PDB file of all heavy atoms in Angstrom:
ATOM      1  N   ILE A  48       5.901  -3.803   6.945  1.00 26.10           N
ATOM      2  CA  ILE A  48       5.896  -4.861   5.908  1.00 26.10           C
ATOM      3  C   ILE A  48       7.301  -5.499   5.885  1.00 26.10           C
ATOM      4  O   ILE A  48       8.265  -4.819   6.306  1.00 26.10           O
ATOM      5  CB  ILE A  48       5.482  -4.243   4.559  1.00 26.10           C
ATOM      6  CG1 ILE A  48       5.139  -5.305   3.507  1.00 26.10           C
ATOM      7  CG2 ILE A  48       6.530  -3.252   4.046  1.00 26.10           C
ATOM      8  CD1 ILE A  48       4.440  -4.770   2.240  1.00 26.10           C
ATOM      9  N   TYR A  49       7.439  -6.747   5.425  1.00 27.13           N
ATOM     10  CA  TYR A  49       8.770  -7.382   5.239  1.00 27.13           C
ATOM     11  C   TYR A  49       9.121  -7.246   3.758  1.00 27.13           C
ATOM     12  O   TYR A  49       8.272  -7.548   2.912  1.00 27.13           O
ATOM     13  CB  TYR A  49       8.812  -8.814   5.787  1.00 27.13           C
ATOM     14  CG  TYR A  49       9.191  -8.863   7.249  1.00 27.13           C
ATOM     15  CD1 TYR A  49       8.592  -8.036   8.179  1.00 27.13           C
ATOM     16  CD2 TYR A  49      10.190  -9.707   7.707  1.00 27.13           C
ATOM     17  CE1 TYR A  49       8.888  -8.102   9.528  1.00 27.13           C
ATOM     18  CE2 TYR A  49      10.541  -9.752   9.048  1.00 27.13           C
ATOM     19  CZ  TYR A  49       9.909  -8.923   9.957  1.00 27.13           C
ATOM     20  OH  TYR A  49      10.233  -8.971  11.283  1.00 27.13           O
ATOM     21  N   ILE A  50      10.339  -6.774   3.449  1.00 23.31           N
ATOM     22  CA  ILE A  50      10.839  -6.552   2.075  1.00 23.31           C
ATOM     23  C   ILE A  50      12.114  -7.410   1.987  1.00 23.31           C
ATOM     24  O   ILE A  50      13.083  -7.091   2.710  1.00 23.31           O
ATOM     25  CB  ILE A  50      11.088  -5.053   1.816  1.00 23.31           C
ATOM     26  CG1 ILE A  50       9.825  -4.194   1.961  1.00 23.31           C
ATOM     27  CG2 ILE A  50      11.704  -4.833   0.447  1.00 23.31           C
ATOM     28  CD1 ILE A  50       8.734  -4.509   0.978  1.00 23.31           C
ATOM     29  N   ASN A  51      12.080  -8.505   1.229  1.00 21.60           N
ATOM     30  CA  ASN A  51      13.243  -9.439   1.164  1.00 21.60           C
ATOM     31  C   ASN A  51      13.627  -9.838   2.599  1.00 21.60           C
ATOM     32  O   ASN A  51      14.842  -9.834   2.898  1.00 21.60           O
ATOM     33  CB  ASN A  51      14.386  -8.819   0.363  1.00 21.60           C
ATOM     34  CG  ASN A  51      14.060  -8.532  -1.086  1.00 21.60           C
ATOM     35  OD1 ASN A  51      13.157  -9.153  -1.664  1.00 21.60           O
ATOM     36  ND2 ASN A  51      14.807  -7.614  -1.700  1.00 21.60           N
ATOM     37  N   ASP A  52      12.628 -10.144   3.427  1.00 22.86           N
ATOM     38  CA  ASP A  52      12.740 -10.622   4.840  1.00 22.86           C
ATOM     39  C   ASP A  52      13.359  -9.582   5.790  1.00 22.86           C
ATOM     40  O   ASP A  52      13.794  -9.961   6.905  1.00 22.86           O
ATOM     41  CB  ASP A  52      13.459 -11.978   4.847  1.00 22.86           C
ATOM     42  CG  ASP A  52      12.473 -13.079   4.504  1.00 22.86           C
ATOM     43  OD1 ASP A  52      11.457 -13.223   5.243  1.00 22.86           O
ATOM     44  OD2 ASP A  52      12.690 -13.740   3.483  1.00 22.86           O
ATOM     45  N   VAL A  53      13.321  -8.302   5.443  1.00 28.95           N
ATOM     46  CA  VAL A  53      13.785  -7.181   6.308  1.00 28.95           C
ATOM     47  C   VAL A  53      12.562  -6.375   6.763  1.00 28.95           C
ATOM     48  O   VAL A  53      11.774  -5.917   5.906  1.00 28.95           O
ATOM     49  CB  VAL A  53      14.817  -6.312   5.579  1.00 28.95           C
ATOM     50  CG1 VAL A  53      15.242  -5.095   6.400  1.00 28.95           C
ATOM     51  CG2 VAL A  53      16.014  -7.182   5.149  1.00 28.95           C
ATOM     52  N   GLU A  54      12.426  -6.219   8.071  1.00 30.39           N
ATOM     53  CA  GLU A  54      11.366  -5.376   8.679  1.00 30.39           C
ATOM     54  C   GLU A  54      11.493  -3.942   8.179  1.00 30.39           C
ATOM     55  O   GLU A  54      12.590  -3.356   8.333  1.00 30.39           O
ATOM     56  CB  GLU A  54      11.469  -5.416  10.199  1.00 30.39           C
ATOM     57  CG  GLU A  54      10.255  -4.806  10.878  1.00 30.39           C
ATOM     58  CD  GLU A  54      10.373  -4.671  12.391  1.00 30.39           C
ATOM     59  OE1 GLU A  54      11.436  -5.028  12.941  1.00 30.39           O
ATOM     60  OE2 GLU A  54       9.409  -4.220  13.004  1.00 30.39           O
ATOM     61  N   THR A  55      10.434  -3.411   7.555  1.00 31.76           N
ATOM     62  CA  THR A  55      10.463  -2.107   6.843  1.00 31.76           C
ATOM     63  C   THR A  55       9.220  -1.280   7.223  1.00 31.76           C
ATOM     64  O   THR A  55       8.058  -1.753   7.070  1.00 31.76           O
ATOM     65  CB  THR A  55      10.489  -2.334   5.320  1.00 31.76           C
ATOM     66  OG1 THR A  55      11.620  -3.149   5.007  1.00 31.76           O
ATOM     67  CG2 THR A  55      10.513  -1.043   4.528  1.00 31.76           C
ATOM     68  N   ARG A  56       9.425  -0.054   7.670  1.00 29.24           N
ATOM     69  CA  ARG A  56       8.305   0.846   7.970  1.00 29.24           C
ATOM     70  C   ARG A  56       7.660   1.283   6.674  1.00 29.24           C
ATOM     71  O   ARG A  56       8.393   1.561   5.683  1.00 29.24           O
ATOM     72  CB  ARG A  56       8.784   2.089   8.727  1.00 29.24           C
ATOM     73  CG  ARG A  56       9.156   1.827  10.179  1.00 29.24           C
ATOM     74  CD  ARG A  56       9.412   3.161  10.891  1.00 29.24           C
ATOM     75  NE  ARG A  56      10.638   3.684  10.287  1.00 29.24           N
ATOM     76  CZ  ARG A  56      11.878   3.424  10.714  1.00 29.24           C
ATOM     77  NH1 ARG A  56      12.086   2.723  11.822  1.00 29.24           N
ATOM     78  NH2 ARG A  56      12.908   3.897  10.036  1.00 29.24           N
ATOM     79  N   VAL A  57       6.339   1.306   6.664  1.00 29.34           N
ATOM     80  CA  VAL A  57       5.533   1.865   5.539  1.00 29.34           C
ATOM     81  C   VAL A  57       5.326   3.363   5.797  1.00 29.34           C
ATOM     82  O   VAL A  57       4.643   3.692   6.792  1.00 29.34           O
ATOM     83  CB  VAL A  57       4.220   1.091   5.347  1.00 29.34           C
ATOM     84  CG1 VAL A  57       3.322   1.742   4.305  1.00 29.34           C
ATOM     85  CG2 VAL A  57       4.502  -0.383   5.026  1.00 29.34           C
ATOM     86  N   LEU A  58       5.855   4.228   4.924  1.00 28.78           N
ATOM     87  CA  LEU A  58       5.747   5.696   5.130  1.00 28.78           C
ATOM     88  C   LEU A  58       4.384   6.178   4.653  1.00 28.78           C
ATOM     89  O   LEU A  58       3.914   7.185   5.219  1.00 28.78           O
ATOM     90  CB  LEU A  58       6.869   6.433   4.409  1.00 28.78           C
ATOM     91  CG  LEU A  58       8.287   6.115   4.896  1.00 28.78           C
ATOM     92  CD1 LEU A  58       9.351   6.772   4.035  1.00 28.78           C
ATOM     93  CD2 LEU A  58       8.443   6.458   6.359  1.00 28.78           C
ATOM     94  N   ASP A  59       3.780   5.506   3.668  1.00 33.09           N
ATOM     95  CA  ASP A  59       2.468   5.872   3.104  1.00 33.09           C
ATOM     96  C   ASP A  59       1.914   4.651   2.377  1.00 33.09           C
ATOM     97  O   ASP A  59       2.713   3.896   1.734  1.00 33.09           O
ATOM     98  CB  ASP A  59       2.587   7.071   2.160  1.00 33.09           C
ATOM     99  CG  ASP A  59       1.210   7.547   1.730  1.00 33.09           C
ATOM    100  OD1 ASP A  59       0.380   7.801   2.632  1.00 33.09           O
ATOM    101  OD2 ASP A  59       0.936   7.513   0.515  1.00 33.09           O
ATOM    102  N   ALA A  60       0.605   4.460   2.410  1.00 35.96           N
ATOM    103  CA  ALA A  60      -0.053   3.397   1.618  1.00 35.96           C
ATOM    104  C   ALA A  60      -1.408   3.935   1.151  1.00 35.96           C
ATOM    105  O   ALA A  60      -2.135   4.536   1.967  1.00 35.96           O
ATOM    106  CB  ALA A  60      -0.168   2.093   2.351  1.00 35.96           C
ATOM    107  N   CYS A  61      -1.680   3.845  -0.144  1.00 36.74           N
ATOM    108  CA  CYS A  61      -2.939   4.394  -0.704  1.00 36.74           C
ATOM    109  C   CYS A  61      -3.587   3.347  -1.612  1.00 36.74           C
ATOM    110  O   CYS A  61      -2.969   2.946  -2.646  1.00 36.74           O
ATOM    111  CB  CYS A  61      -2.677   5.671  -1.467  1.00 36.74           C
ATOM    112  SG  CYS A  61      -4.216   6.296  -2.199  1.00 36.74           S
ATOM    113  N   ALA A  62      -4.752   2.858  -1.190  1.00 39.62           N
ATOM    114  CA  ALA A  62      -5.572   1.902  -1.956  1.00 39.62           C
ATOM    115  C   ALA A  62      -6.327   2.692  -3.010  1.00 39.62           C
ATOM    116  O   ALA A  62      -7.262   3.520  -2.652  1.00 39.62           O
ATOM    117  CB  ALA A  62      -6.530   1.165  -1.055  1.00 39.62           C
ATOM    118  N   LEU A  63      -5.954   2.536  -4.267  1.00 38.60           N
ATOM    119  CA  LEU A  63      -6.528   3.365  -5.352  1.00 38.60           C
ATOM    120  C   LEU A  63      -7.978   2.957  -5.637  1.00 38.60           C
ATOM    121  O   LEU A  63      -8.301   1.758  -5.637  1.00 38.60           O
ATOM    122  CB  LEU A  63      -5.702   3.262  -6.627  1.00 38.60           C
ATOM    123  CG  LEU A  63      -4.249   3.716  -6.548  1.00 38.60           C
ATOM    124  CD1 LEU A  63      -3.624   3.585  -7.940  1.00 38.60           C
ATOM    125  CD2 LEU A  63      -4.166   5.145  -6.011  1.00 38.60           C
ATOM    126  N   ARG A  64      -8.795   3.960  -5.978  1.00 41.79           N
ATOM    127  CA  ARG A  64     -10.190   3.803  -6.453  1.00 41.79           C
ATOM    128  C   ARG A  64     -10.382   4.757  -7.625  1.00 41.79           C
ATOM    129  O   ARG A  64      -9.681   5.797  -7.641  1.00 41.79           O
ATOM    130  CB  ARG A  64     -11.209   4.127  -5.364  1.00 41.79           C
ATOM    131  CG  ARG A  64     -10.957   3.321  -4.110  1.00 41.79           C
ATOM    132  CD  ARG A  64     -12.012   3.503  -3.049  1.00 41.79           C
ATOM    133  NE  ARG A  64     -13.299   2.930  -3.378  1.00 41.79           N
ATOM    134  CZ  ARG A  64     -13.658   1.674  -3.123  1.00 41.79           C
ATOM    135  NH1 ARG A  64     -12.798   0.803  -2.614  1.00 41.79           N
ATOM    136  NH2 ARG A  64     -14.886   1.305  -3.417  1.00 41.79           N
ATOM    137  N   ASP A  65     -11.197   4.405  -8.601  1.00 42.46           N
ATOM    138  CA  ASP A  65     -11.495   5.345  -9.700  1.00 42.46           C
ATOM    139  C   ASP A  65     -12.463   6.442  -9.213  1.00 42.46           C
ATOM    140  O   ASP A  65     -12.841   6.529  -8.010  1.00 42.46           O
ATOM    141  CB  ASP A  65     -11.897   4.646 -10.980  1.00 42.46           C
ATOM    142  CG  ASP A  65     -13.278   4.011 -10.953  1.00 42.46           C
ATOM    143  OD1 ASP A  65     -14.041   4.330 -10.048  1.00 42.46           O
ATOM    144  OD2 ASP A  65     -13.507   3.233 -11.863  1.00 42.46           O
ATOM    145  N   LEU A  66     -12.756   7.368 -10.120  1.00 41.41           N
ATOM    146  CA  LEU A  66     -13.521   8.574  -9.715  1.00 41.41           C
ATOM    147  C   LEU A  66     -15.001   8.235  -9.543  1.00 41.41           C
ATOM    148  O   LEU A  66     -15.674   9.112  -8.987  1.00 41.41           O
ATOM    149  CB  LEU A  66     -13.363   9.681 -10.751  1.00 41.41           C
ATOM    150  CG  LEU A  66     -11.962  10.269 -10.865  1.00 41.41           C
ATOM    151  CD1 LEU A  66     -11.930  11.413 -11.891  1.00 41.41           C
ATOM    152  CD2 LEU A  66     -11.446  10.707  -9.520  1.00 41.41           C
ATOM    153  N   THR A  67     -15.468   7.049  -9.934  1.00 40.37           N
ATOM    154  CA  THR A  67     -16.788   6.494  -9.472  1.00 40.37           C
ATOM    155  C   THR A  67     -16.675   5.838  -8.077  1.00 40.37           C
ATOM    156  O   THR A  67     -17.704   5.333  -7.575  1.00 40.37           O
ATOM    157  CB  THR A  67     -17.366   5.526 -10.513  1.00 40.37           C
ATOM    158  OG1 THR A  67     -16.634   4.296 -10.578  1.00 40.37           O
ATOM    159  CG2 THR A  67     -17.425   6.158 -11.889  1.00 40.37           C
ATOM    160  N   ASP A  68     -15.520   5.902  -7.398  1.00 41.14           N
ATOM    161  CA  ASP A  68     -15.317   5.343  -6.046  1.00 41.14           C
ATOM    162  C   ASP A  68     -15.448   3.815  -6.179  1.00 41.14           C
ATOM    163  O   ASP A  68     -16.026   3.194  -5.261  1.00 41.14           O
ATOM    164  CB  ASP A  68     -16.309   5.900  -5.002  1.00 41.14           C
ATOM    165  CG  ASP A  68     -15.955   5.526  -3.584  1.00 41.14           C
ATOM    166  OD1 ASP A  68     -14.775   5.280  -3.306  1.00 41.14           O
ATOM    167  OD2 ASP A  68     -16.875   5.456  -2.725  1.00 41.14           O
ATOM    168  N   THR A  69     -14.929   3.241  -7.271  1.00 39.62           N
ATOM    169  CA  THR A  69     -14.842   1.770  -7.482  1.00 39.62           C
ATOM    170  C   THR A  69     -13.393   1.292  -7.246  1.00 39.62           C
ATOM    171  O   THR A  69     -12.447   1.948  -7.734  1.00 39.62           O
ATOM    172  CB  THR A  69     -15.299   1.346  -8.881  1.00 39.62           C
ATOM    173  OG1 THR A  69     -16.623   1.848  -9.133  1.00 39.62           O
ATOM    174  CG2 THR A  69     -15.412  -0.147  -9.093  1.00 39.62           C
ATOM    175  N   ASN A  70     -13.239   0.183  -6.537  1.00 39.36           N
ATOM    176  CA  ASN A  70     -11.935  -0.465  -6.266  1.00 39.36           C
ATOM    177  C   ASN A  70     -11.124  -0.571  -7.580  1.00 39.36           C
ATOM    178  O   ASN A  70     -11.659  -1.079  -8.604  1.00 39.36           O
ATOM    179  CB  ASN A  70     -12.154  -1.854  -5.656  1.00 39.36           C
ATOM    180  CG  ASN A  70     -10.850  -2.571  -5.372  1.00 39.36           C
ATOM    181  OD1 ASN A  70      -9.931  -1.966  -4.808  1.00 39.36           O
ATOM    182  ND2 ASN A  70     -10.745  -3.829  -5.802  1.00 39.36           N
ATOM    183  N   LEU A  71      -9.808  -0.241  -7.550  1.00 40.23           N
ATOM    184  CA  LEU A  71      -8.890  -0.629  -8.657  1.00 40.23           C
ATOM    185  C   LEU A  71      -7.931  -1.789  -8.282  1.00 40.23           C
ATOM    186  O   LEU A  71      -7.240  -2.289  -9.180  1.00 40.23           O
ATOM    187  CB  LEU A  71      -8.135   0.636  -9.061  1.00 40.23           C
ATOM    188  CG  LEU A  71      -8.982   1.706  -9.768  1.00 40.23           C
ATOM    189  CD1 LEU A  71      -8.226   3.017  -9.882  1.00 40.23           C
ATOM    190  CD2 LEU A  71      -9.444   1.232 -11.116  1.00 40.23           C
TER     191      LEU A  71
END
């Protein structure tokens, strides 16, 4: 990802969902 136009490695990314498995 670019952070303030600096190339930055993503160490972890987690797309959250509720416990009914619905998008948050």
Side-chain angles (χ1 to χ4, degrees):
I48 193 168
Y49 272 48
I50 300 297
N51 297 337
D52 279 301
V53 176
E54 191 187 2
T55 303
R56 287 189 292 271
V57 174
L58 297 174
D59 187 53
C61 178
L63 299 182
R64 306 186 69 88
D65 72 14
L66 293 182
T67 71
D68 190 26
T69 306
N70 179 46
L71 290 169

